[PDB]
Symmetry: C3
Subunit: 281 residues, 3 copies
C-alpha cells in the first residue's frame, strides 16, 4: 500500500486504541543495539503484523514490533526490528512507519546504526555524531521520496541542509563529557551504500577521496522521511572497523565481527541514549 495520509491514519488509530500512549519521541535502534527497548516502562508491544497497513515482513523474518511506553519520564515509541532497503522493501513500505510516528505526535527521532570507518582517525568502538550525508541511491534515482508527493506530510522538494539538528548533537556530546567518554565521540559525514555487500576495498578508497567519514546501509531513508514531515533527528554511528586500514592490511569484514563490537558497546550506548531522552528540551 501507499504511504499516504489515509493509510497512515488507519494505523495510528489502531495503535492509539491499543496502547493509550501518545509519544513525542521515536527511536530506531541498530543491529545488536536494542537493549534499551527492553526497559521501556509500562510498555505495550505491538507486532507489525497486527497493525493495519504496516508492511509485510515475513519473508525476511525475525523480530518486528512497535513498542510504546515511558523512559525517564518521557513518552516514547520504538521500532524493534528495523526495515532495510537491501531486503527489497519499497519506498512506500519504509516511509509508512515514520509517517505513523508523525501522526502519533512524534517531534524528535533518535537513530543508531553500525558503520564502517573511512576517516583515518576512526577506530573500532568509536561513536560518530552524523552531521550530513552522501545519498548514493538518491543521486541515482532510488531516493525514498521518488513517486507522487504526499502533500499532507511535506513539500515536493525538501531541503536537507538542517536534517541533523545541531543542538541535539551538542546535547549528546555534553552527556559524553559528563561521563568521561568524550574521547570516543567524533562527528562526521555518512555515506549510504544500498548494500547488502560490504563496501569493497576500492569503494572504500573512493569514499575517502570524496570526503566521507563513515559508510553504512541504513538510516538515510528514515532521516529523509522525518525531515520531509518536520521531525528533528539525531543519528549516531558505532564504528565496527576501519575499512581503509583493513584494505591496506588485507583483513576481512564479516557480520560476526560486527556484532561482537555491538555487544562490547551496547550497555554504554543504552546509558547514553537513556540520558539523552531524559534531557531532551
Amino acid at each position: 500500500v501507499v504511504a499516504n495520509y489515509e493509510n497512515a491514519s488507519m494505523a495510528a488509530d489502531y495503535i492509539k486504541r491499543v496502547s493509550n500512549v501518545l509519544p513525542d519521541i521515536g527511536i530506531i535502534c541498530g543491529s545488536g543495539l536494542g537493549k534499551l527497548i527492553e526497559e521501556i516502562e509500562e510498555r505495550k508491544v505491538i507486532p507489525y503484523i497486527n497493525i493495519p497497513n504496516f508492511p509485510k515482513t515475513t519473508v525476511a523474518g525475525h523480530v518486528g514490533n512497535l513498542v510504546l511506553g515511558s523512559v525517564g519520564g518521557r513518552k516514547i515509541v520504538a521500532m524493534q526490528g528495523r526495515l532495510h532497503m537491501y531486503e527489497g522493501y519499497s519506498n512506500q513500505e519504509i516511509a509508512l512507519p515514520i509517517r505513523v510516528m508523525k501522526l502519533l505526535g512524534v517531534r524528535v527521532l533518535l537513530i543508531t546504526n553500525l558503520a564502517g570507518g573511512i576517516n583515518r582517525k576512526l577506530k573500532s568502538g568509536d561513536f560518530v555524531l552524523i552531521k550530513g550525508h552522501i545519498n548514493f541511491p538518491g543521486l541515482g534515482l532510488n531516493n525514498v521520496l521518488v513517486g507522487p508527493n504526499q502533500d499532507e506530510f511535506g513539500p515536493r522538494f525538501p531541503d536537507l541542509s538542517n536534517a541533523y539538528d545541531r543542538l541535539l548533537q551538542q546535547l549528546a556530546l555534553k552527556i559524553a563529557q559528563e561521563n568521561d567518554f568524550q574521547d570516543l565521540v567524533h562527528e562526521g559525514v555518512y555515506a549510504f551504500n544500498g548494500g547488502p555487500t560490504y563496501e569493497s576495498p576500492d569503494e572504500s578508497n573512493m569514499l575517502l577521496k570524496l570526503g566521507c567519514d563513515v559508510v553504512g546501509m541504513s538510516t538515510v531513508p528514515e532521516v529523509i522521511i522525518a525531515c520531509h514531515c518536520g521531525i528533528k533527528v539525531l543519528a549516531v554511528s558505532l564504528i565496527a572497523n576501519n575499512s581503509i586500514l583493513d584494505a591496506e592490511n588485507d583483513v576481512s569484514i564479516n557480520h560476526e565481527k560486527v556484532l561482537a563490537v555491538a555487544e562490547k558497546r551496547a550497555d554504554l550506548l543504552q546509558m547514553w541514549f537513556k540520558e539523552i531522552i531524559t534531557r531532551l528540551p
Copy 2:
C-alpha cells in the same frame, strides 16, 4: 505502454490529423520558464490525455499539453508540462514524447532547466550552456535506455560524446553578445541528481571535487533519447543559487526562492530563445 515504433506512430498520426503542423524544432521549458509557449503563432493546444499512448499524468496533476505552431517563421512543437523521473514515471513514459517528436520531423531540440551552481564562478541568475554531463542514475542501472533496444530509433550502445552540439552553443553565445548580456553566460558540466530532495551540503561538496559545474533533476533523460535517435540538442541551465556558498554560510534552498529567480530571468530567456529559433541554420 512501451516507447516502441508502433505506439509512437499512432500518437504522431493523431497529432498530424489535429494540428496540420509539421515541425522541425522541439522545445522543453523549465519550471517558470514557459512564457514563450504562450506566444506561439497560429497555435494548436493538445492535452496529453487526449493523445493515444501518451503517459498518464493525473496523479502528479498540473498542466500537460503539446503545443504546435510557428515562431519566427519556423514550425515548432513544445512540451508544456515536462515529465520528471522523480515523480515515478518509467523510462518508457519519458521516452515516448521525444520519439513522437522524431516521427513528426524534429531535427533540433532546445531545453531549459533550473539548477544549483557548484562552480565558484556561478551566481544566482547566471546562465550555463551545457557541454557535457555526469549521469548518476545511468552509472547506477537507472539509465533511460535500460530495457530492450528499439532498433528503429537508434543503436544498442549510443555514444554521447557529441550530445550537446557545439555550433548551437556558439550561436547562443553570439546572440547574448549581440544584446550585451554575455557577462551572464558560462559553459559547464551538468550533474543529474535523481531527486526530489535538493542536493545536500555534503553532496554539493562531493560534486565540486568531481568536476561538476551545476546540478539538477531533469534534462539528461531527454538528451539521451534525442541523441539515440539523431536529434541535435542545446541545453541551458538557469542558476537558482550557489550550493557551495550556501553550505559555507548555512543558507537554505527552497522552491519559493527558486521560482523567484525564474520569474526574474523569464523575459530575457524568452527573448533569447525566440532569436535562437529564428536563427537556427
Copy 3:
C-alpha cells in the same frame, strides 16, 4: 522466477540428465570473445529456452546456450550468450545460471569482457587482470543481491575483499610471460557503469579522479553471485579504447570499433584461456 535453491536444483537436474558432464570450471566470455566455446571437446549444447527455470531471453534475441564438455582434460560449462542488466533482466534472472553452476559442482569461474581504458597507461588491445571493483549500481540500491537472502547459497552480508583470487591472477600472468606477451598485461580496478550508453567524456574524467583503471557494463553482478556462494573468480578486460585520450581529442566510441578490437585479439585470448584451464590447480 526467484533464484532460490529449489528452482536452481530443478535446472541442474535437467542439465545432468542431458549432458552427463559434471564440470568443476565455468566460463563466461565477452562480446566477440567466444571462439573457445566452439572447440569444447565431446560437447553438448543446451539452449537456455529448453532448461527449466532459466530466464526468458527472446526479447533481446541472439544466441543463448549452455555448453558442456572437456578442455585440456578438464570438465567445463560455458555460457554462450551472456545476460546483461542493461537489457532489463532482474537480479533473479542474472543470478540463477551462476547458482546452477554452483549446484553442478563449479569451483572456479573465468570471465572476459570488453572495457574502456581510463588509466593513461592503457592502450587499445591491452589486457587488464581485474583486482577489485567500484560497483555504482550497488552503491545506489541496484546491487544484484538486493532482495531476500537465499541462505543455502551464502550469507546476508558478503565480504568482497577476496572476490578476485590472487593466485589465479599470478597464474594468468605467468602464462603470458611464458609466451612473451606480458607487455600487454596490466592489473587494475573495474568500474561498473550500468549502461547501455558508453561513458560520457565527463563521466570518464570523473572515473580517473576516483581511481578507476577501466570501465564496463558487465561482470560485477556475476562476480558478486559467485563470491556469495564460494566460487573463485578470474576476470580479464580487453581494452577497446582509452576514453580519456578520446575525450581530449574529440574521438567517438562505437560498437563497430569495439568489435574490431575483439576480432584482433580473439585468437590470443583463446590460446591464453585454454592454457589457464589446463593449468588450474
